[PDB]
Ligand binder design. Sequence first.
Ligand code: 2YB
Ligand code: OLC
Length: 434
Amino acid sequence: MDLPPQLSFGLYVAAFALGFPLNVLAIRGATAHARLRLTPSAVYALNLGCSDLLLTVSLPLKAVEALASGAWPLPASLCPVFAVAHFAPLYAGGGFLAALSAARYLGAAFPPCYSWGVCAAIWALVLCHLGLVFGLEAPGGWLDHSNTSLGINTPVNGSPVCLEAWDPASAGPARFSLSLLLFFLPLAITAFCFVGCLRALARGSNIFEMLRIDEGLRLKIYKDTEGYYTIGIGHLLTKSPSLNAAKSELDKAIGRNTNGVITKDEAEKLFNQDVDAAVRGILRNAKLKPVYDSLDAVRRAALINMVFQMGETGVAGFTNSLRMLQQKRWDEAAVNLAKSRWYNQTPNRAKRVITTFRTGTWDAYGSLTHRRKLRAAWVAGGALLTLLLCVGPYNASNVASFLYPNLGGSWRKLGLITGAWSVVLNPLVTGYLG
Ligand SMILES: Cc1cc(OCCCS(C)(=O)=O)cc(C)c1-c1cccc(COc2ccc3c(c2)OC[C@H]3CC(=O)O)c1
Ligand SMILES: CCCCCCCC/C=C\CCCCCCCC(=O)OC[C@H](O)CO
């Protein structure tokens, strides 16, 4: 179950070669974003980029160690610099990944000083923790009164080992404790945020924003696509071929001599009345009521949308689709509605409403806040994946060999390799490339 030393070498070199440019680009993206705007996510990504670049730069030393079958073939004095450059990022990374995913989650689900403090604390924890254990209890450390270089064990003559032959009785509790705090806790935070991002999308909008998107806003009377006098947020004034009749209905509905021009507050009031009317139209129609009642929130909005555009009786004529919707036969319903004159007359809007019926999500309505929520979900999902795939096995190895010290070194070796590939997968998931 031992990897050939060449395979290990190659795996570390590949992570190094890819990780260096990837993290230089990530740092640059993050640095351009903070400097232009200045946001928490950018700060966490910058710290994650710097830490990954530090890990990256340490990897060639891990590579040559592998080629030497675990022996340290470099000056002994390099071992402490390697110690910090390699393992501080291996623990700090998870903290920054969780922070980023929490920043993205909160910024999108609930739309500077904190960020930097949080990063300082992560760094302070990792450096004091590793430094104090290492400084105190590593071979050559404060407690060692021998002629030993700091961090070097020599299990047999001529065979110095940096870190990896360290007494598990010292290294194990340190690894274990820090893995709980800086991996497993972040993992749970990241999973929580990922779930939160998904729920936020599921209920991240409503009929009002959806119809605003579909209807837009005009303050002066205009002719809709059929040529009827219309105002505000898709408010039909009249079908009549008469501007005066249109002005007269406008004035009546507001309580004022508008002269065909209204404010944004007034348009918003009408819009509210029209949506209530469309909702009341549904509830007093024997064909629409039971369908509406059986529907989740997002699909109710789609049905309200149709009624707002076509009125209760128009929508009630779609008897097959309605039946489908009540039976939760989404795709069958969509196939029917696609054949409608409605789909033929206004296909962009009809596709958006019908897609909303098929999926039950707001994805057809790519508003700024929806895309920000999508962005957040992808970042937390990517973070979850990189936590589980890369530094995950390493930290699980730390936990396992602490609880079961009977375990051999095989699992730790592989966990170190997957941990090193975090320098590749991290910059790819944080979203700051280009
Ligand atoms: C404390 C110190 C002292 C130091 O003196 C150098 C001068 C030598 S002289 C003039 O006095 O002769 C130099 C350094 C860099 C440091 C240091 C500061 C901060 C963190 C770390 C890394 O510490 C680890 C590294 C890995 C591990 C540590 C600690 O614990 C376990 C395992 C991780 C694992 O297996 O998961 C060194
Ligand atoms: C605060 C000291 C932290 C050190 C403890 C290390 C333990 C590692 C666990 C979690 C790190 C991630 C915690 C979540 C940080 C995200 C905060 C955030 O979302 O910031 C938005 C904005 O700045 C708000 O005003």
